[PDB]
Amino acid sequence: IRIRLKAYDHRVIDQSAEKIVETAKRSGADVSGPIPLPTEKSVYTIIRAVHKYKDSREQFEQRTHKRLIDIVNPTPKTVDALMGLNLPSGVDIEIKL
């Protein structure tokens, strides 16, 4: 019942925070609010120069945003409508079930 989503972009995880609670309320079912889970920041530090010019570093990040939505009353119309995930090809879905 623990539907969790991981996304690189915070906008598609906010949209994924919604749009599935709405297909949960499409049937008669109570769903827990989108739980803001701590994002995971991966930081990379590389030398800008192609050779020797150190102390000039370009820093890059990659934030994996996370959400938790819990269905509290799983009805049959929710397990059939659980495939209506409108994933923009970049939002990972993990339904614990």
Partner: protein, 202 residues
């Protein structure tokens, strides 16, 4: 080292990624598949006015959206040409049936198309000043707020590298709330390589 890359600076803020997919694991192989597709597209669709290539992945299926200034040249006479593109990509690893062709109506308003158009004329013994000025004139005529062009290295066949830079209008490369299309192209001549950079701001 003076100017930050305009695309890299604005990516995530106002620009969006080309490779739009998630991979907690197997990221290295999935990413290198993207470059493998893009590199194959680069030479196969060389004479087609291809500007951007977006690779999307969902349900073990690779979605490719190729923005081109010459639709029909990529698609074919109803789909024959795009079919060869799809199956040639199809032979590589998995299936990638989704290929979408997007028309680029204002070819002279795309940095990659303008830069490539400039670079191909430069290879055909053309004036390094006329190609810049004429291309700049077309974009400003098309409503662009400002265009900046630069051609570098052995201009006209000289023994010393130079850099002819011409600009018109407004091209603020310090403002972040502004979409400046930037692209770099190479023109391999008998005297060496050339460097073309275009800054089209709309």
């Amino acid at each position: 080292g003076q100017k930050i890359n305009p695309i890299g600076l604005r990516v995530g803020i106002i620009r969006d990624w080309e490779a739009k997919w998630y991979a907690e694991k197997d990221f290295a192989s999935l990413l290198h598949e993207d470059l493998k597709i893009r590199k194959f597209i680069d030479n196969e669709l060389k004479e087609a006015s291809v500007s951007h290539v977006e690779i999307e992945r969902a349900a073990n299926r690779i979605n490719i959206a190729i923005h081109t200034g010459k639709p029909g040249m990529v698609i074919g006479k109803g789909g024959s040409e795009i079919e060869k593109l799809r199956n040639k990509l199809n032979a590589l690893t998995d299936k990638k049936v989704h290929i979408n062709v997007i028309e680029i109506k204002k070819v002279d308003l795309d940095a990659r198309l303008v830069a490539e158009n400039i670079a191909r004329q430069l290879e055909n013994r053309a004036s390094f000043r006329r190609v810049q000025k004429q291309a700049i004139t077309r974009a400003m005529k098309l409503g662009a707020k400002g265009i900046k062009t630069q051609v570098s290295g052995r201009l006209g066949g000289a023994d010393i590298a130079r850099a002819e830079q011409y600009s018109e209008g407004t091209v603020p490369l310090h403002t972040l709330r502004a979409d400046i299309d930037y692209a770099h192209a190479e023109a391999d001549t008998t005297y060496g390589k050339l460097g073309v950079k275009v800054w089209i701001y709309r």
